[PDB]
């Protein structure tokens with residue numbers, strides 16, 4: 001497989017663009033630049049904020065299983081003692097895929113997802 | 116160990132390939148306009164490459180720290196992961212249930 | 213023990229709690245079952261119970277058998293045979309233990325499953341709940357608890373309905389027997405508490421009937437003590453009284469289903485006959501040594517891991533459904549037979565009859581054929597259950613919630629249905645007739661005959677001559693109408709005399725309100741003139757020659773007067789509302805002159821007459837002269853004012869009727885209710901099908917093949933910039949067509965007020 005390239009090497013050799021808008025939005029006449037001094041100032045602030053923490057929950061967090069919801073209630077009760085900076089929920093919030101129902105007797109798939 | 120090797124292989128494949136979906140569009144279709152989002156060309160500083168069919172890990176390759184909190188409920192434990200941006204530590208956490 | 217009432221899984225793996233019946237008592241008992249698994253390898257390995265095996269796969273194989281505990285503890289933890297090492301995938305590993313028990317033991321069977329092998333007369337309890345209105349009843353108590361005029365109206369409604377249902381109550385009295393008292397309403401603690409009171413007063417020997425369509429089933433089992441055997445089921449107190457008195461019929465029906473299908477009373481669901489078909493098909497499949505594609509966790513068939521990956525064939529298989537429905541527009545002076553069809557799918561499966569990579573497995577198909585023949589013979593011998601089953605097959609072959617759902621099976625049945633309809637059209641036409649229209653529910657047939665009273669004999673001969681061909685042995689061919697004279701451009705736009713005259717025109721709906729009555733008037737005048745001409749020509753002995761002459765001059769005089777009036781009043785606030793053109797679903801186009809739209813509509817209807825094109829055409833010229841428009845002017849040309857939005861193969865579960873429904877060309881009553889029966893379709897089910905169609909077309913756009921724009925070769929490579937013949941690549945679904953589809957979706961969503969569909973449309977852009 002062709003060798004990967006370290007982030008710094010890629011950024012410096014493409015011309016150090018801001019491909020996100022972390023520093024500024026681009027136009028067709030103006031490609032935004034990832035200004036070095038602001039990059040350094042932000043990096044120092046990043047090292048300064050010792051307390052920030054990102055909490056990632058595991059995948060396949062099916063909200064329609066009581067065991068999931070019980071486990072999750074315990075976890076969030078821990079997190080309320082000391083809130084994350086950020087909390088990534090992810091991945092398939094229902095046990096079954098939620099698709100067009102074949103019948104009207106049971107509560108429909110979309111409605112169940114909303115519940 | 117097997118579990119280590121089959122995740123070194125994963126992240127090395129993804130980051131050497133530089134792109135989150137190496138597969139042909141006849142095996143994983145991409146919205147043609149939005150394929151630029153799957154490209155990783157300036158390799159990200161961290162990647163939460165979440166995957167339910169592999170072990171948890173917090174590898175590093177080419178300076179990219181790739182982590183995977185593979186599944187929420189596994190082996191009768193709730194599993195979640197604490198990435199710490201101001202030090203790039205990755206403290207895994209679990210609750211028994 | 214040698215009879216079962218319920219299976220359920222224990223908390224711990226591989227173990228079932230079972231409720232069994234013998235010696236006149238229910239007993240609680242417990243089984244241990246091993247999990248059977250299949251595995252496939254390209255190369256041999258056998259480290260260790262594991263058995264090398266042979267069985268047909270779904271489109272080196274080892275059977276594997278463990279107690280679920282050791283399988284589970286090994287598989288998720290160790291460097292075992294279940295992890296890597298050239299596995300092509302576990303096949304049957306999803307089947308729940310009690311769903312293995314129901315297949316191999318059934319009703320007519322801790323305890324090892326190793327040695328188990330292949331008159332109700334007891335009490336009932338009841339817990340139906342109508343969301344706050346929890347309702348409780350017993351076959352062993354003289355009062356009923358109905359939670360948040362009340363008692364008085366209850367008493368007389370009970371008396372009236374009891375009088376209405378006496379014989380039904382009496383005949384099923386020995387199952388559930390009668391008047392009782394009443395009571396009514398933190399409150400939710402009474403549900404757990406009084407269910408303990410139930411258990412305290414009947415430890416066993418009574419059966420609990422759970423719920424009804426306004427379900428909250430899982431939360432109900434949280435309130436309810438989960439240890440009972442439970443029959444799960446899914447001023448308006450009339451409904452509740454009716455259900456309570458209906459209970460005996462339900463017990464009788466459930467006993468009939470169980471005694472037929474060998475499924476325990478608690479496990480089978482009345483709410484879906486497809487499940488009974490699933491288990492009963494699974495038996496005959498494993499008995500014919502097919503690896504079973506039962507899937508518990510997801511709709512898609514458990515082919516092993518491969519089912520999770522996108523595939524162009526699979527996505528085509530899921531996205532595709534349209535019948536190539538024939539529509540030969542015209543005028544027909546011959547009598548036309550309006551032939552209904554039903555049991556077409558069943559007929560194809562019965563009468564049906566690697567290199568092909570989206571054909572369903574021929575072994576499994578042969579099993580379904582022979583099994584359907586078995587069910588059908590038992591229906592002919594008046595088994596209500598087998599009859600209901602064969603009627604419900606059309607749902608199961610389509611339903612993704614079927615445990616043995618397979619998109620390949622759905623598609624195999626569907627395209628065989630398509631071929632069979634084309635062969636049915638071939639058969640009718642081979643017998644000298646000609647088809648006006650044909651789809652999966654209906655055929656309109658030109659007879660080469662002129663009189664209905666002459667043809668009430670020949671029509672029955674014709675239909676018999678079709679059904680007596682073996683290819684159509686099981687068809688419900690039914691002559692639903694006789695059309696004496698027919699004007700036809702599509703099933704939403706026709707008129708004719710039936711043996712008396714009816715007219716319906718989606719065309720009419722787009723004319724401004726002043727002109728809609730005018731359109732119907734001239735359509736009756738056209739029918740009258742055509743009929744006068746037909747009967748005149750027949751008294752004198754394609755017969756329509758000269759029909760324009762009976763009304764052309766009045767029509768021109770009328771149109772001239774209307775044109776003068778339009779110049780007077782189209783701008784006038786006194787009248788403009790009658791000139792305003794209606795916004796509607798699939799409203800195709802903008803129009804500047806509404807009278808011209810009426811004239812275009814009339815002329816188009818009359819131009820359907822292939823025999824008489826010239827006289828109509830000359831009249832059309834003389835009409836357009838009023839506007840000084842030239843005979844062939846692009847404005848004067850008739851383009852259909854409506855854009856179709858067809859949701860293919862909608863299911864009316866109330867009568868198992870499969871219909872394409874067109875949200876634009878069909879009238880609203882045919883959208884919000886069935887055409888054959890007249891039960892209403894659920895609104896959210898309806899919107900979900902529109903969103904499924906929308907997303908199916910967006911995906912079909914993104915997954916399309918590209919085609920060369922000047923030689924039509926397909927783009928086979930991945931990185932060419934153009935075809936080798938110098939032609940630019942273009943889509944097989946051009947972007948303009950999909951823009952138009954999203955436009956009609958937004959129109960339909962705005963008009964019918966489909967909030968879910970409209971928010972989906974909003975979330976595309978935003």
Ligand SMILES: [Zn+2]
Pocket residue numbers: 864865866867868869886887888889890891
């Ligand atoms: Zn119906």
Ligand SMILES: [Zn+2]
Pocket residue numbers: 920921922923924925935936937938939
């Ligand atoms: Zn070409």
